[PDB]
Amino acid sequence: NDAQLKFANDVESRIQRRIEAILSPIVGNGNVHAQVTAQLDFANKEQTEEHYSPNGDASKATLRSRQLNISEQVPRSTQRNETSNYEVDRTIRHTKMNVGDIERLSVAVVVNYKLPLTADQMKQIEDLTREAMGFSDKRGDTLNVVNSPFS
Amino acid sequence: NDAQLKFANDVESRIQRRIEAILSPIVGNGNVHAQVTAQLDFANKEQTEEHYSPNGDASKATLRSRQLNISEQVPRSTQRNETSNYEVDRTIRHTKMNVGDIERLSVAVVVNYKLPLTADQMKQIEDLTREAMGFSDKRGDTLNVVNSPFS
Amino acid sequence: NDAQLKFANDVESRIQRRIEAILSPIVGNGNVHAQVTAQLDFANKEQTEEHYSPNGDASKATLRSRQLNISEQVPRSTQRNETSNYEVDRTIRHTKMNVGDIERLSVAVVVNYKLPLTADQMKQIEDLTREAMGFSDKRGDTLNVVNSPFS
Amino acid sequence: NDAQLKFANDVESRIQRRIEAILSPIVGNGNVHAQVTAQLDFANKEQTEEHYSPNGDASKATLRSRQLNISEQVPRSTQRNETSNYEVDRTIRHTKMNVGDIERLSVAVVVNYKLPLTADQMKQIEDLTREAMGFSDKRGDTLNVVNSPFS
Amino acid sequence: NDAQLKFANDVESRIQRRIEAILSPIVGNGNVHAQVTAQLDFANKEQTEEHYSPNGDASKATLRSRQLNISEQVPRSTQRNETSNYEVDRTIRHTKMNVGDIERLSVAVVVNYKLPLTADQMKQIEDLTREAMGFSDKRGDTLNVVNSPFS
């Protein structure tokens, strides 16, 4: 059960290699460092939807039977019994989610100096990293690229 | 059952290596120290939702049957029996949570002097660490970075 | 059953190493002493919630059946029988709490003199220790840092 | 069953070492003596709550069924039968308390003379000991620190 | 069954060592004598509470069913049947008390002369002993410290 720290370190080290491999051409072979933090989902999880389709509108219902009596006398004693058995469209998904999916990523990138990099030259580094992470805003991913001279 | 102190020390030592590895380029190889405290969740925990979908609106219900009598005499003796059997959309999740997830993190970082670091140079260290923790405010994570000369 | 004093001493000695390791850079290698007291929870404990969702509002109930008669004569003899069978959303958690969690921490820290430390230099030591404990105020944790010359 | 005096002496000797270890830096290596008395709980004890949630307010009840007849003639002969079957939220804890927890602590500390210690220098010794005990006022803990010359 | 005099002598000799060990620094190595008398409880004893929670107030009851008829004619012939089945919150403790707990302590302390000790110097000896006993007034503990020259 501590093989999930080994697994989560494989997920981080692959995202991290990908970020250094795509920035090493630009800034240089060793002028960039990235560290990735992944929150993974190791919870088992099943699910079973069972949608039905609304048949409240008669122009899209599917009757199997229908007994419609319509008495009427004329003092206007009316009447209108009406049974209706239906056939209903039914979807039934049944997922069994994957154990070990990324829930959220946090990436920190430091790029060396050349002398600071240009603000435009630094946006095209944020955007490259935003594709090497697989940056999704619906996961709540976070990226921080800073520019500062190494040692 | 004291293998949870070994496990919680693996979680802390990985977050701690990640914080030193991303700050060592900036401040220097040994001018930064981080100590991480993780409160983990070792409680077993199952769950089983069983949502249904509201069919109170007839424009989205799904009838299986419907016997609607509507007598009426005209002294206006009316009547309107109406059975209705429904089909209901039903989701059924069934999670089995993971034993050993981080509930809350506390990180303490001390960075050496260069001579204090600039207040801007110290924010870009708080923000880098905020990504090396996986800092989540909904977990109640806490970070403290202080700048003070070593020995 | 006295292996709980061995376990509670592992919990204390890890918090204590973490406090000395994060203050040794500042004050010096041996100018700080910390002693941690942990009240642990060794009670076995299960639980089983079983929440339901309120369906008192018809715009969010889920009917399975509904037999609604509405007689009426006009001396205005009215009537309105109305059975309603419901489908109810039901969560069912089932926790089995962990044996050996920290209920409350008490930490006492003594830091040597340099000559007293500055009141600001002593707050940034209380705050570092507040992160090396995992200080939670909802647990009722308590910390006391005093500054006084050693022997 | 006299292994509870051995156990209660381990609880006392650990609290006592912790108090001498945190005061030895201040007052000196052998100028402080502490003796701890612990009243432990060796009673076996189970428990089983079974809370329910109040559904007296209709805006938070969960009906399973509901047969509501409302006759009425107009000499205003009214009527209003109303069965209601409910679904109720139910928690069920089941603790099995730990055998050997501290119920109450009593600590007595004597610190040597330097020449009496200052009243402020003696409060910062009461407060350090109040953290080395794990002093809880809800347990009814008691501490007495006195200052008097040794022999 | 005379192993209870051996056990009660272990309880007394531990409280007695603790009182001499905390007063020997003050008065001297052999200027203090203490004798402890413990009344122990060797009665076996079980117990089983079974509390319920009052549901007399409708704003905190939990109904399972409720059939409420409310007839009424208007000569104002009223009526109001009302069955109500309840769900009740129920705790169930089950203690099995410990055989061999201290019911009451009696401690007698004689401290040598220096020349009588000061009335203040003798209160700080009563208070130290009051912590080395574990002095509880709800047990009916009794302490007597007298000052008189030895032989």
From Swiss-Prot, chains A, B, C, D, E:
Is Lyase among the key words of this record? no
Q: Would the keyword Cytoplasm turn up in this protein's UniProt record?
A: no
Induction data: Inhibited in nutrient-poor medium.
Q: Which UniProt keywords apply?
A: Bacterial flagellum, Cell inner membrane, Cell membrane, Membrane, Transmembrane, Transmembrane helix
Cellular compartments annotated: Cell inner membrane; Bacterial flagellum basal body
- Report the principal subcellular site: membrane
For the biological process aspect of GO, one term held by this record is: bacterial-type flagellum-dependent cell motility
Homology family: Belongs to the FliF family.
Listed under subunit, the entry gives: The basal body constitutes a major portion of the flagellar organelle and consists of four rings (L,P,S, and M) mounted on a central rod. The M ring is integral to the inner membrane of the cell and may be connected to the flagellar rod via the S ring. The S (supramembrane ring) lies just distal to the M ring. The L and P rings lie in the outer membrane and the periplasmic space, respectively.
What is this protein's function? The M ring may be actively involved in energy transduction.
Q: What is this protein called?
A: Flagellar M-ring protein
Gene (name only): fliF
Q: Which start and end residues of the full protein are shown?
A: 231 to 438 of 560
